[PDB]
Symmetry: C3
Subunit: 533 residues, 3 copies
């Protein structure tokens, strides 16, 4: 007849006898090295812990007191990690850069929430007195995703009667805090201390039968400022290659006009910016408005309500304006040009219509409808670039009140040339293995594949060389040919052409190339790793 | 050469010959006999149904007519289930409490939507005439997740030659309805009837080769009111232990000032509350406002617009106010205190700025911008706690119009001390196996692990003892040592300290402990379950 | 003692030696169909392509210039695909209708995002001058989900020594564009060209050991307009049967009063509609308003603010109305009836409260609070139905300004009788296998099971015959008994009764029945498929 596979019953296999346990450890804190950077060390050695995985680092955030504006960057927990390294008596087993750990967890909304993504943390709070509480104390949790979590117990790190050391290097606190001038960052930085604790799932296993494993170790290279090339040397067995860009704000004071806070949509960034500009853009004054630079060009709105700024027509109509007063428009709030009587980037020209009602009670304008063409790039321009030496105009024609509200943003994990990484600034990408073109593209097809294959909406241009199921199989890799000089991956990009009279032209770019090398994990006489060659 | 595993082709195995079928059954309804609670009984007896799984219970909701405010709780279908039991001739095979079924499906957005989560059902509707329709008839669907759905046909319940009985126990209709005093709940409760139907996926199988299986049966223990301990006895082979708290509103009339309806975000709860208070908070009156208790302290807003309530400064500026009228501020709308010389919890002090415009056409204030520090706890205070014997003040200084709009909320599945379970009220947790400490924590590390391992945002403090793949392996369990007295799990919490002058300090709490025991399923003389023991 | 399976270690198997590669191809464009329909042709054959899967089609959308309102339908990429077929020398291997491909990807948010779902694309933009840019050029990506992606390399299509041809048939551009009369669609349609490119993951495999496979091929039948029956013939081995309805707008000009754009919630549809009606519903005029048809009944709002339209009372109160002017209410904005002095469907009766403030500066009413009972069906009524011959009334008593803003919507993938498919129009469903009733239901239990089993919130009434794991097992199917005449699936529905004096009654319906037949894939003398019988 016919031999059939039973799809209604199963012979329940008896597994290895084990007992899991959640373990938490306090570490050893050290302020040694460059600018006395914080390093936490956690030593795991126990006769009963046979294997482990699922590392979670918790951080105690202090009470923030005083005057000024202060808020934490979104996912504050991931952003204060600089480097993570797992090692034994035989040396490093696995290690990752903070930004690469963050990139691996970006598709895990739970891990991101736990690390600190809330109104309480991420909104920009204000202290009114020196004894006022800006932020209340809080605990954040950072999931340190490792290759040991992939297939739970099967993929766990076995401790071959060895001592495992987890070392966490922290970023300066300046990187995770959004603040204004008024805030006393100097004494905050002096008083701040990283208070960490490491948790992991430990397994007490009876009669383990250890076998060798394979692990992928991410390695990254950052190019020279504004160079559209980068190279990864000694590439012998890679499972994937990822490419992205980062802005470099070293030529600026890292001050930006606005920040949306906990609301992180592209619309939220734009709305926060427009709201800051509208304070100085439309003025209801008796005579001509006062307290603006001499270079400012504030014009009385005509009876038809249209103000012409060259080619741009701005329609301004404000209701209930008192008889003794008039409506004025700032026609050059933020200006940029590299040549006199030539092209100009004027933010006031990005407004089509402004409508509202004047409040006799609060003596201010309440804006109803605003038609504009402000984008995520405009909100991402550092205030330094508006007032650069290249600019023939004064640039920043805002009030001193507005300039005082500007924020310092030093988020370490920004990509592209805008806060949302919306703008694609790569026109073409070429990857070479030796001198042979391995891959090229004129569109982000590699990012599209990344997002589809990993079911993430925050992908990067990625080349995958391994489609083989993890843990149960030895991974598939791009393999070197040293004799033919094929022992390196060279990435070359063509950046999209930008307007010289737009301030973003002057945001410095850095090309980031991430390579995942294959390693063999051997548990013969303690845990050891070997680079596949 | 190298022996290689084919990763590009597979030998497609021929499975068991079977035919699936969706089956629907009407039951037998019974209101016998404690508080005359509704019980629906469904008998599956067919010579051709070899196995089954994926139980879906449907409920016909009636047309709600009359006057008053009425709405259904979110996920109405799950909230009306008290208990579910599956039985054989040999007894119960599997059973679960309503709240535990809900907790297992809480991360299934599809199952939750199907159960009743819409603007049509969950918004608080109002009836203006006795013949007015408040709610239209509707059907909701409840996915009764069982261990038999885990691996589809492999995990299905085999009927063999036995008769399967599914029994559903329902909660009072009072638990699933949000209403005001105006609504005639008395005749609604009299006339309401649960109209259920059970659906399941049945499999007609040719030449079944049945083998024994393992099943996890959740068992829960609720502690005494305000007891920070609970114990699960006869723990011999458990796969997990879960711990959470529930509020107990028995010391209250279950009335709350506001409810957001279908909009269930923390911001939605806060916005609904602020909106209710603003009606009495800022008044545009000719002379001093009337219709408030003598204990109300309503003050005329000065020319600078700032009203000082002790340390708190409230900025009130209303545009287009008529010349014959003035702007007033209610400085003690809600106020709590246990001494006449102590700290006062005043809700009017939680406001920094209130701005708007008076409408000459509709004779009302239209609020534009409001700066406040109202949180989810404030929206979760029962009105009874504001007017408790512990409070030396009158407490509720609102108008009779506002007090008439208060809602009765009896949702059976609330956790913590707020409607969103945002506030973590446990400071420490200790789990003991016998008298030996098995696990302790001073932070919700076990909840963080629960949320990460189950990829969920609605976790609980959970200890998992099983990391082994389900169905294909016998589960891993915490095992008893009866001689050493290690055959019980004792949970002890330490609740976080709250200010005695905050009304939320008087919310009664109950500790819930859920334990998943391992059972062996045998199909010799029909279906039978055996508790795994030494 | 006891035999235990190792749950902590695995012998990492060495897989087949292969190298993946992302390949992109330009096709051959052809306008050779009935109405000169666009066909793209892609030919795949190579030494180093042994297998392939994960088909992604990219489309270059042009810059849209000129005057008028224009926007793209949501998920424009999927909506422009009419049919897809994969074939070899031996004929077709797999093929799908555009709507069925879309239905399979509807639960993949990433795939839907990539296909064109943004405010930039889907919001209705306006061109003010003939040289004005309405839409900027853009690239969208369409994931052509095939049975070959299910289990990655294991399920991949092997090419053998065969040439694979991927044929894409496109819908008219008319189907993917939302526009008004002002827009010059005539020259847009003339100038528009589909610019496609096919990408796939190709595998260079060393020493392939090919084995036969099984594939499910979806096949659909569309019933006659308004016929509550449809039959699928030659059903021998089906894995599932799906049933849904579609509106037919052939009896209309495909014009609708409003469209929400990027915002696609039921509330967004209703809000966009109310906003369009309010322009003509409440008028602030000196004397009786002008520029409305003689059939319009515009009434001055009394001192109490209540206007009675038969049984319906509408409360209207507008602030800051000038002394020389009064507030008017349009009591029959849109009205329908099949007889004089009988039942009437009047849109003005669906309002109970309208409040706002008149703006002296912009000479318009700014509405604050609106109480109404407008639903998703009202927003889904084609304007043709309001002004049909069946209507004894004029029907559309709006202003010429409002009528000029009406939009053409030809979205090919609409289900039910409303844009959100909210309203269930099927009261009963009966499925017959031969002349024997296989399944019947009076509620959408089969849709509930579909949504639960496939973890989707956009399911259909579906009968699943296969619960067996894919690729590793031969699928389970409903099997024919040709001698007993049991080789066909007949579907019969009962539609819910609709009011003859409601315009939606006149929306025509079509029954869609989808059947997934089982086929064997064999690789002897090239790639070839055989229907299981």
């Amino acid at each position: 007849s016919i031999k059939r596979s039973n799809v209604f019953a199963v012979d329940s296999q008896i597994p290895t006898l084990y007992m899991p346990q959640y373990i938490s450890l306090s570490g050893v804190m050290t302020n040694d090295g460059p600018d006395n950077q914080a390093i936490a060390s956690f030593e795991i050695r126990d006769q009963y812990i046979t294997a482990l995985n699922h590392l979670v680092l918790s951080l105690e955030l202090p009470e923030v007191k005083g005057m000024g504006r202060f808020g934490y960057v979104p996912y504050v927990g991931y952003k204060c990690i600089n480097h993570v390294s797992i090692s034994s008596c035989n040396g490093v087993i696995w290690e990752i850069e903070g930004e690469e750990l963050y990139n691996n967890c970006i598709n895990n909304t739970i891990a991101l929430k736990h690390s600190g993504y809330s109104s309480e943390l991420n909104d920009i709070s204000i202290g009114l007195t020196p004894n006022d509480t800006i932020k209340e104390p809080s605990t954040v949790y950072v999931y340190i995703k490792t290759p040991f979590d992939v297939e739970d117990t099967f993929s766990s790190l076995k401790l071959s009667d060895s001592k495992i050391t987890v070392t966490v290097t922290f970023n300066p606190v300046s990187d995770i805090v959004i603040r204004d001038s008024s805030f006393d960052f100097e004494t905050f930085n002096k008083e701040f201390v990283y208070v960490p604790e490491l948790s992991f799932i430990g397994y007490m296993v009876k009669n383990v039968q250890i076998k060798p494993s394979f692990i992928e170790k991410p390695r990254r290279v950052i190019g020279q400022i504004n160079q559209p090339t980068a190279t990864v040397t000694e590439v012998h067995a890679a499972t994937s290659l990822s490419v992205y860009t980062k802005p470099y704000y070293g030529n600026t004071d890292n001050k930006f006009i606005s920040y949306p806070g906990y609301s992180q949509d592209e619309k939220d960034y734009i709305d926060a910016y427009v709201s800051r500009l509208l304070d100085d853009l439309v003025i209801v004054s008796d005579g001509p408005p006062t307290g603006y630079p001499e270079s400012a060009e504030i014009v009385e709105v005509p009876e038809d309500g249209i103000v012409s700024i060259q080619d741009a027509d701005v329609y301004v109509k404000i209701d209930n304006v008192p008889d003794n007063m008039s409506v004025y428009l700032h026609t050059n709030l933020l200006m940029f040009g590299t040549r006199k009587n030539s092209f100009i980037y004027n933010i006031s020209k990005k407004f089509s219509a402004i409508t509202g009602t004047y409040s006799d009670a609060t003596k201010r304008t309440i804006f109803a409808h605003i038609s504009h063409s402000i984008n995520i790039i405009d909100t991402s321009i550092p205030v330094s670039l508006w007032t650069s030496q290249r600019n023939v105009y004064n640039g920043d024609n805002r009030s001193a009140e507005s300039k005082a509200k500007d924020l310092f943003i030093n988020d370490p994990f920004i990509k592209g040339i805008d806060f949302k990484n919306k703008t694609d600034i790569i026109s073409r990408l070429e990857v070479r293995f030796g001198n042979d073109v391995l891959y090229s593209e004129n569109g982000p097809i590699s990012r599209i594949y990344n997002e589809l294959l990993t079911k993430s909406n925050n992908g990067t241009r990625t080349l995958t060389f391994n489609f083989t199921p993890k843990i149960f199989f030895r991974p598939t890799t791009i393999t070197a040919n040293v004799s033919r000089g094929k022992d390196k991956l060279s990435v070359r990009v063509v950046y999209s052409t930008m307007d010289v009279n737009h301030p973003i032209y002057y945001v410095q770019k850095q090309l980031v190339v991430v390579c995942n090398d294959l390693y063999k994990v051997s548990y013969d006489q303690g845990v050891s790793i070997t680079k596949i060659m």
